[PDB]
Amino acid sequence: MSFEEVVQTLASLATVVQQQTIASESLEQRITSLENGLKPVYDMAKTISSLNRVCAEMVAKYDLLLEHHHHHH
Amino acid sequence: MSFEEVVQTLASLATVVQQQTIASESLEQRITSLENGLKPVYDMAKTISSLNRVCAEMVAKYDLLLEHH
Amino acid sequence: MSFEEVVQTLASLATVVQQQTIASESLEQRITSLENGLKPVYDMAKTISSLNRVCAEMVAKYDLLLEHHHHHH
Amino acid sequence: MSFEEVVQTLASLATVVQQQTIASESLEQRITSLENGLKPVYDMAKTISSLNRVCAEMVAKYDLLLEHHHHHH
Amino acid sequence: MSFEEVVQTLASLATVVQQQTIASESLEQRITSLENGLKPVYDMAKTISSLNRVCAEMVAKYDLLLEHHHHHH
Amino acid sequence: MSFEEVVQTLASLATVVQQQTIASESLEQRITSLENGLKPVYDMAKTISSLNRVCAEMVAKYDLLLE
């Protein structure tokens, strides 16, 4: 290798390593964003329990008809 | 108040009573069909206890893994 | 078995039969109304069965999220 | 027809008419029960409104993922 | 550039590159974790759409019960 | 560091940099794939507006029929 090629190559490598850094950080931003977007979905449990209680309440309104069904079917 | 009139009234009244039997039987069958339509009510009601169970299990798991850990 | 007896009993029956026509028209109106009214009621019970299935589906899918939190946190 | 056969007839019609009154009262009880069974379902509005709130709460958990979607595609 | 300046730049470039590797391995791990976590999250979004349709169906069926009330009461 | 060691180091780093460009295109595509998965979420969210409205209309109608 000539000293010229060592210099050109080292200069071309630095321009790439520079671009990789900018690309990384940007990627890291999108990753963090997605991670953070996921977090609130862990608290779905409470809303699912509310859905269950709504379901149970809807069913309960049919108690009298269900009793009629038990006697006539 | 003629005997003739009483006989004719009885026969006419008999027809009317038969007409009422027919009409009443149709009303019965209409109510029966309405009662037959309670089936989805029964099928609906049958699903709630299983749902209450899987939800209770979810709540426990959420409690253990997220409320504390 | 007197003629006055036959006539009075026939007049009695006549009015009872007339009464029943009236009672039957009333039940017929009430049945028509129930046919109209119970149609959406029964239809809704079908939608409530769907709601219950969708709720259980939510629960099972959210369970996978819980397994992820257990497995990755 | 004879006077004998009138009492025969008149008596026989009273049994049918009597029987019809019983069948009709039995039917009236079934109608009443179905009418009473329908009533509680009128109150489903409040519960459907609760379901709507649940739906909106569930959607709201995805606000941050949805923000990410907006900025990226 | 002199020879001593080429070695300055090289040892300086190696340190960002060795850092970048460690950073990218960490980013890789975080994306892998997201790939697992977002599976049930996206899946639940589909169930929530179903839920929303079910709610709209409940409202439309119940509307007919409200129409029944309006006409018969 | 001799001239030879500077050359060997350069080629050593050139290889490491090559593998990092490759890995970054990979990590880029995985993220982009996850992001495309946000459509079902966008689709879910666009429906809530209509749903609130028809429910509000139902509630109002119910209240009117009570009054």
State the DSSP string of D16-45: HHHHHHHHHHHHHHHHHHHHHHHGGGGGHH
Gap between the terminal Cα atoms of chain F: 94
Q: Is A65 on the interface with C (CB under 8 A)?
A: yes
Give the number of other CB atoms < 10 A from CB of residue C54. 21
Picking from C2, C46, C52 by the largest number of B CB atoms within 10 A of its own CB, the best residue to mutate is C52
Structure-token match 């009244």, residue found: B13
Question: B35 and A66 in contact by Cβ < 8 A?
Answer: no
Give the number of other CB atoms < 10 A from CB of residue B49. 10
- E65, burial (CB in 10 Å: exposed 0-12, middle 13-18, buried 19+): buried
* Chains B and E make contact, 3+ CB pairs within 8 Å: no
* Cα–Cα nearest to E66, from A43, D46, D60: D46
Residues of B in contact with A56 (CB under 8 A): 48, 51-52
Residues of A in contact with E38 (CB under 8 A): 34, 38
Question: F40 and E52 in contact by Cβ < 8 A?
Answer: no
Give the number of other CB atoms < 10 A from CB of residue D2. 7
Question: B58 and C63 in contact by Cβ < 8 A?
Answer: yes
Chains near C, with 3+ CB pairs < 8 A?
A, B, D, E
**By CA distance, what is A43's nearest residue in C?**
C62
User: How many structural domains compose chain F?
Assistant: 1
- E69, burial (CB in 10 Å: exposed 0-12, middle 13-18, buried 19+): middle
Q: Is C45 on the interface with D (CB under 8 A)?
A: no
Question: D44 and E59 in contact by Cβ < 8 A?
Answer: no
**By CA distance, what is C51's nearest residue in D?**
D51
- Residue A61, H or E segment: none
* Cα–Cα nearest to D13, from C10, C24, B25: C10
Write down how long chain A is.
73
Residue F27 contacts residue A27 (beta carbons within 8 Å): yes
Residues of F in contact with A30 (CB under 8 A): 31, 35
Residues of B in contact with D9 (CB under 8 A): 10, 14
Question: E24 and A24 in contact by Cβ < 8 A?
Answer: yes
**Phi and psi at residue C46, in whole multiples of 5°?**
-65, -40
- Written as one letter, the residue type at E53 is R
Picking from A42, A46, A64, A72 by the largest number of C CB atoms within 10 A of its own CB, the best residue to mutate is A42
**By CA distance, what is E30's nearest residue in C?**
C72
- Calculate ∠ Cα F60-F61-F66, nearest 5°: 100
**By CA distance, what is C70's nearest residue in A?**
A42
**By CA distance, what is B63's nearest residue in A?**
A45
- Written as one letter, the residue type at E49 is S
What is the rounded distance in angstroms from the CA atom of residue F59 to the CA atom of residue F67?
A: 12
Give residue F8's domain range.
1-67
- E10, burial (CB in 10 Å: exposed 0-12, middle 13-18, buried 19+): buried
Residue B34 contacts residue A65 (beta carbons within 8 Å): no
Q: Is D21 on the interface with C (CB under 8 A)?
A: yes
* A40 secondary structure, DSSP code: G
Residues of C in contact with A52 (CB under 8 A): 55
Chain E: closest CA distance from residue A65 (Å): 15
Structure-token match 């990627």, residue found: A27
